[PDB]
Amino acid sequence: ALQTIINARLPGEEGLWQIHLQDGKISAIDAQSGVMPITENSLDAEQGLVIPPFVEPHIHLDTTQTAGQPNWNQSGTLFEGIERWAERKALLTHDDVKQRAWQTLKWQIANGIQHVRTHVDVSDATLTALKAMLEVKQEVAPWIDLQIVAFPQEGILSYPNGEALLEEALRLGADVVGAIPHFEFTREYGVESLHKTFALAQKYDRLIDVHCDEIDDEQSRFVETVAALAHHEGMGARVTASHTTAMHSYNGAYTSRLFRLLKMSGINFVANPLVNIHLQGRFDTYPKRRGITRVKEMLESGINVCFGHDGVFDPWYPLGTANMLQVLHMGLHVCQLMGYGQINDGLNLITHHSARTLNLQDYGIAAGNSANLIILPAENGFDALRRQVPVRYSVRGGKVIASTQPAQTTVYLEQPEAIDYKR
Amino acid sequence: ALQTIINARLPGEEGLWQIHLQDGKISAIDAQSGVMPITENSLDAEQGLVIPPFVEPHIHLDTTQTAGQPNWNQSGTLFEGIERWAERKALLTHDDVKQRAWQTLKWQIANGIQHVRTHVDVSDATLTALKAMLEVKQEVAPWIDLQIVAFPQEGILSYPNGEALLEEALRLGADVVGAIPHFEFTREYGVESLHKTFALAQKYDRLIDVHCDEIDDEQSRFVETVAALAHHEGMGARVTASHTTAMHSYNGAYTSRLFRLLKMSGINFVANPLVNIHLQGRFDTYPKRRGITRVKEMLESGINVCFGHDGVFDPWYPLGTANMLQVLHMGLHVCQLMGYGQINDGLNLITHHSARTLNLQDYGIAAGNSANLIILPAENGFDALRRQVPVRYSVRGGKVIASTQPAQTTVYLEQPEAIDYKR
Ligand SMILES: [Fe+3]
Ligand SMILES: [Fe+3]
Ligand SMILES: [Mg+2]
Ligand SMILES: [Mg+2]
């Protein structure tokens, strides 16, 4: 079994490092003064970057892989997506959900993602997708720690037996309580739904992840209730507000007042760049707003924010290969986090910040932690992002669970020349 | 030498096709009723997509590869970019320009780009970068047909001897006359600069490519003069308006009136998604506009529009690997061209539409044309875009000038499994 990871670069650290492994855990981390020779039981990072696993804090594995079945969304609109999904009703079965979820999960494993939080629609009396996902969670456990959010897609108070179904999902094992206040019939139902969500989270000792203010409505401010209730219960770490795209449209004065509460509350924020740029701003003509939450300001204020892919190859987001560096690339551009350091530190948005969002207790390259880490064939975060590098090796429990042999490009000039896109 | 390309898929066509080659040209194109066997002198597209070469209609090879030299742009702003570039003055020499231009050109060759239009700053009495680029043009000719735009970066009327230098650049061989009306001191200088630009283009029989209205100013309407002068001279095909980001902020009534002229004029438009999303909207707080020109509406109106990378690894755009599918990916998202067909037809924005913009006379998979084509290991444009596939083979004059052996990804579950990110 692997005993050491050598010649590793670490974000924010100078030089090369050696990571000693023992019994599936990291036993020690020592600096090197030069390049170490490879040997049996040693995985050579070859001066590449070693980081804890990529994390997917927000994805919908119950709808993934269905784009084009039976028809494609030609307009690319949310409205048509709903219609196209409805046309696939007959195919939505236990086995179908498991098959599609597993397909995307395999892409995630290949992409060095070892932690995934999937929302699952529980506005379904049969709870078909949930029962399927609970089995998938057990099956994929050796490679990915999957969290399931009981997501009341049609509302808690605005859907028949919505609250009862949400609680049933928790009784069946869902890890996180979801909500969607801006989709409830009224602002009052929205606020009330959050009180019910928090009550359930405290009753069952579960995390919370709200689809919060995902709308270009400057009056959608459910985020303040999410943060206030978290602060009141002293449970910020266990709470997440997903999307908050409405924040992109708030006036600056309210946002400034709100930020004090956001920081004090300690709650987490998830932005989903690929989907947000696609679905937001659809009611604008020109100019058209970007519609992503205030990521840059959150980072400047020390508020934990991270990036999710949200949808993969489905009616609402037709693209994706479940690649976090791709999600990061889009987020850095749309959020204008384009300074060298901002780009280089970008990896935090798809690693450490996301681990905090999932309230992970065993994450990071540190002595005592499980030997879960990935190797990127790049010098630093900037380089990894610029070249959209694959994951050379993914290690879990001290064992390699995925590897990618990089593409080899050659140009035939007066003589053949290898091209690696580095200067 | 290669005599045939077999098992090729073609955009907009059903089935597989065989492309016969002779004397460096395409002699015939025949449909296949099934898969053909490989053989000596046959390049197997393996049911991948075959298209004419990718095109880079707008890049600055004189500034490429300088990011971080001597210091990095930490804010990521245009302002700091100017300062960082100024700090590298001592390194700007003939050989330096040639070295950096060639580095990016090699990345472009590796990425199946056989046609490139580079702007070169001619607001320099020594015309250092231009003299260097003219040599590069000759040197890279076997692999890339390079067009040079004499770009008066500091203005024609607003810079000492600006007009004389612009004309000198044409007398030295620049292929295209550039301008930048919104950067001139006054609106009047802006309009006058365009009359001078058109007069020079007609005097020397050159193309025109104006950095046009690249500013979030709803009053920057130099595009109407570019189109009107083109229509008056009956030279629309030879004219291009780059950027036109101001159009993102125009009221709809003026835009509707303007579009009639744009269509009648026949001029070309270049949008630069990666840079536009980064540099535009910088004076907005929240909400923040996207700042890309009206690509979707242009396509719906039959106005030729295409995508350029603009900057690669420089003070103003720190990222990039000169990859057109990456540029396309950003453009489809920001312009909300996310319907299945819109994404699939996206390849036109980086192939045929760009060829028209460069006024290319030998481009396309058609009998009689030079055997210049590339092979993508994908089923169609949608698939190529979604998976960000590399160029498997680039063929020029019937000879392979670049090839990429795809990355190989494996996940180790109960058994090893190859992952290709296809469902
Ligand atoms: Fe979601
Ligand atoms: Fe430019
Ligand atoms: Mg959603
Ligand atoms: Mg520019």
Characterize this entry briefly.
The PDB classes it as hydrolase. The structure is cut from a larger assembly and holds two copies of chain A (423 residues). Chain A contains 13 helices and 18 strands.
Tell me what you see in this structure:
This is part of a larger assembly, with two copies of chain A (423 residues). By secondary structure, chain A is of the alpha/beta class. Chain A folds into two domains: 1-53 and 362-423, Urease, subunit C, domain 1 (Roll); 54-361, TIM Barrel (Alpha-Beta Barrel). Chain A is 32% helix and 22% strand. Chain A is built from 13 helices and 18 strands. Chain A has helices spanning 78-86, 94-110, 128-140, 162-171, 187-204, 222-233, 252-265, 273-279, 295-301, 324-334, 340-344, 352-357, 381-387; strands at residues 4-8, 16-22, 25-32, 42-44, 49-51, 54-59, 113-121, 145-151, 176-179, 207-212, 239-243, 268-271, 305-307, 373-376, 393-396, 399-405, 408-412, 416-419. In chain A, the strands form four sheets. The first copy, chain A, has an eight-stranded parallel β-sheet. A four-stranded mixed β-sheet of chain A has the order 3-2-1-4, with no helix packed on it. In chain A, helix 5 links the parallel strand 9 and strand 10. In chain A, helix 2 (94-110) packs parallel to helix 3, helix 5 (187-204) packs parallel to helix 6 and helix 6 packs parallel to helix 7 (252-265). Chain A starts with a strand and ends with a strand. Chains A and B meet through helix 2, helix 8, helix 10, helix 11 and helix 13 of A and helix 2, helix 8, helix 10, helix 11 and helix 13 of B. Strand 16 (399-405) of chain A pairs antiparallel with strand 17 of chain B. One fe (iii) ion binds next to loops of chain A. The PDB classes it as hydrolase.
